[PDB]
Amino acid sequence: KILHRLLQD
Amino acid sequence: HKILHRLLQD
Amino acid sequence: SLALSLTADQMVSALLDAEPPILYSEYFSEASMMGLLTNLADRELVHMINWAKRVPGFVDLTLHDQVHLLECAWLEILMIGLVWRSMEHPGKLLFAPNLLLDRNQGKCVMVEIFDMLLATSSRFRMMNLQGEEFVCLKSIILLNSGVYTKDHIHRVLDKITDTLIHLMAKAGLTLQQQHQRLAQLLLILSHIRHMSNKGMEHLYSMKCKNPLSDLLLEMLDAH
Amino acid sequence: SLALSLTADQMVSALLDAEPPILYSEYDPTRPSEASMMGLLTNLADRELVHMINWAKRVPGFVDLTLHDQVHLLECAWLEILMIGLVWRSMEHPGKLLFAPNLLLDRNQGKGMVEIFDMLLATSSRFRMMNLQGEEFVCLKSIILLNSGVYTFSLEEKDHIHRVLDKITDTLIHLMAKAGLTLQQQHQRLAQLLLILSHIRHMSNKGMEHLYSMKCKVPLSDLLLEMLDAH
Ligand SMILES: N#CC(=C(c1ccc(O)cc1)c1ccc(O)cc1)c1ccccc1
Numbered sequence A: 001k002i003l004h005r006l007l008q009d
Numbered sequence B: 001h002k003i004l005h006r007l008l009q010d
Numbered sequence C: 001s002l003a004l005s006l007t008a009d010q011m012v013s014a015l016l017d018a019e020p021p022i023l024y025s026e027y028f029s030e031a032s033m034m035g036l037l038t039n040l041a042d043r044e045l046v047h048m049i050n051w052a053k054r055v056p057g058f059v060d061l062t063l064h065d066q067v068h069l070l071e072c073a074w075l076e077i078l079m080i081g082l083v084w085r086s087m088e089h090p091g092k093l094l095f096a097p098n099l100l101l102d103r104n105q106g107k108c109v110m111v112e113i114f115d116m117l118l119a120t121s122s123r124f125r126m127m128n129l130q131g132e133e134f135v136c137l138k139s140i141i142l143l144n145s146g147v148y149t150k151d152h153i154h155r156v157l158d159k160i161t162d163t164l165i166h167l168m169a170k171a172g173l174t175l176q177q178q179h180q181r182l183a184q185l186l187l188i189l190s191h192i193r194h195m196s197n198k199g200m201e202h203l204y205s206m207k208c209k210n211p212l213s214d215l216l217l218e219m220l221d222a223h
Numbered sequence D: 001s002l003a004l005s006l007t008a009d010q011m012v013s014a015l016l017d018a019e020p021p022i023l024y025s026e027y028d029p030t031r032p033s034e035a036s037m038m039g040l041l042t043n044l045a046d047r048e049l050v051h052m053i054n055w056a057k058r059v060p061g062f063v064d065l066t067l068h069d070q071v072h073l074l075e076c077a078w079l080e081i082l083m084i085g086l087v088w089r090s091m092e093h094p095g096k097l098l099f100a101p102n103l104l105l106d107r108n109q110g111k112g113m114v115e116i117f118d119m120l121l122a123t124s125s126r127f128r129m130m131n132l133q134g135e136e137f138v139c140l141k142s143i144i145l146l147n148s149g150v151y152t153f154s155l156e157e158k159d160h161i162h163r164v165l166d167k168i169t170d171t172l173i174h175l176m177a178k179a180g181l182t183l184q185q186q187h188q189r190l191a192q193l194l195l196i197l198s199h200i201r202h203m204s205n206k207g208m209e210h211l212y213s214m215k216c217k218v219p220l221s222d223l224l225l226e227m228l229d230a231h
């Protein structure tokens, strides 16, 4: 889930 | 016309 | 014009007396449940149309405008009605007094829409929604949902807002609690819109998959 | 937590500084069609999403939520937020939709696409008539983020979200009392603003199923597909 990227960055 | 038309007039 | 001259109390009484009756269904496998809901919604529509004519301001509209607003909000109004009378039955949907359902039987086809409806019912229960507030929300839906697809309608919408606030100041809510509860109520309308749209495309896929009312076919083949 | 301790002015400032930039499209003129336009809108929305995610984190209260909850809220509201952003920057362009500073369109070129264009134009006209303020707008947008998926995801938790929403409501009212509005006008304008969110939901729902239909037919971002296959 690419949405998990950015959201934990 | 629509059935809705006469429902609004009756 | 006459609608804009009402008092808040007169506005409340007008809507309460305008309330459509609670109908019974024809007393579940797939297609049978859909038949019952279709039959029930078909008969409810006849009452809604007359109810709509009792909503202060609605009569002052062009017939084509009345048609459009109802074509837009008919499923919304049905759903908020269902959710309202389902309040005192947690985890259940009271379609009719002789037709109470939980999400279990609604799995034969729909589960997603039931959960959203049950979620709205839980939200009403938690908010302790009053009948006076409910009839205001419903009439707002009728006047707002198709208002962009008009100044008079906006004057009436403002009138119902004043009515809602009047009701809340009556129950002893502080000014802060008044704009907060107002916001909370109107934000649920976004979800009721969302449920209608989801239910609408389900009926659309159901129509060209094959029966339903010729009136219900108006409401679909115009949405 | 902490977000429930902000003053109204601090709330407004937080949202304003959190505002995502206005992006340009890859629109190269001297050459007009369908699919190409949808490709530009897809390319644009793809890059906006990255900014929206980072914007969403700066929204007071959002960070306090579970990772899974953050995902769900964005999955539900991403098109609503994109559209109200589109409508907002299109205000001073009557009859036009300002997708990007170099991409201004009227209902002509966008010809079921037409139905959504008119609804967006109607919303923009409504904002213009209401004379919507930037402080009000950033409130509405952050309300969409927190409200659009609150009834789809003992955890609650969803009580915290409602507490923040109440804070934004107070913020909105604070703004209206500042602009010299009477208490009656404050309630009415508040109601007027939140009723538009219903139509913003409606436009998003309509746009969502339009994107779903062509998915079986234009190419979409790997992030946009992630969003679609989750609604
Ligand atoms: N819940 C629900 C739905 C209703 C419905 C079902 C069949 C129809 O042909 C029309 C409406 C419904 C809602 C309220 C009510 O008082 C009676 C019926 C529904 C609509 C679409 C999809 C799933 C459910």
Ligand SMILES: N#CC(=C(c1ccc(O)cc1)c1ccc(O)cc1)c1ccccc1
Binding pocket: D038, D041, D042, D044, D045, D048, D082, D083, D085, D086, D099, D113, D116, D120, D206, D207, D208, D210, D211, D220, D224
């Ligand atoms: N207007 C509009 C739509 C946008 C959109 C287009 C393609 C996509 O793949 C995703 C979104 C859009 C909205 C705002 C914005 O800032 C950028 C793009 C749209 C969506 C669905 C159907 C029709 C148009």
